[PDB]
Amino acid sequence: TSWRSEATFQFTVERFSRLSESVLSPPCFVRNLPWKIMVMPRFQKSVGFFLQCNAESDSTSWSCHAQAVLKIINYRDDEKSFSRRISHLFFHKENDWGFSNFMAWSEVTDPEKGFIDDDKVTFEVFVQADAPHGVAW
C-alpha cells in the first residue's frame, strides 16, 4: 500500500541529449507521501539528480526523514550503474535533496558507456523513509 516504508521506482527521461529544463517524474507513494525524481542539466556540463518529497502540498507543518540511493541505470550491465546515497530531513523549505553534479553530462550521454539508448536515460531511486510528522494527525 501507499503506507509502505520503502520503495524503488524508476523514471526514463526521453530526448535526454536535448534536456534544457528540469523534468519531474510522476509520484511514487511512500509513507503516504508523493516522492518524485527530479532531473536537470547543470553547469551540458553535469546531470542534476534530486529526490523530491511532498512538494505540491501547501502545508508547512510536515517533515519526513529518509535515506535513499539515487542511481542512473546502465542498460548494458547493472553492475556499472552509478549510484550515490543521501540522508535528509525533508520539509517545506527543503523538499528536495540530491546532487547538482551527480555525473558528468559527457559521460551519461556517451553512446559507448551504456547509460543512454535511443536518447533515453533511466533514473532509479530506492527510498527508505521514517514515519512523517505533521501529516496524519
Partner: peptide, 4 residues
C-alpha cells in the same frame, strides 16, 4: 548533496 544539497537542495536543487
Amino acid at each position: 548533496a544539497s537542495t536543487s
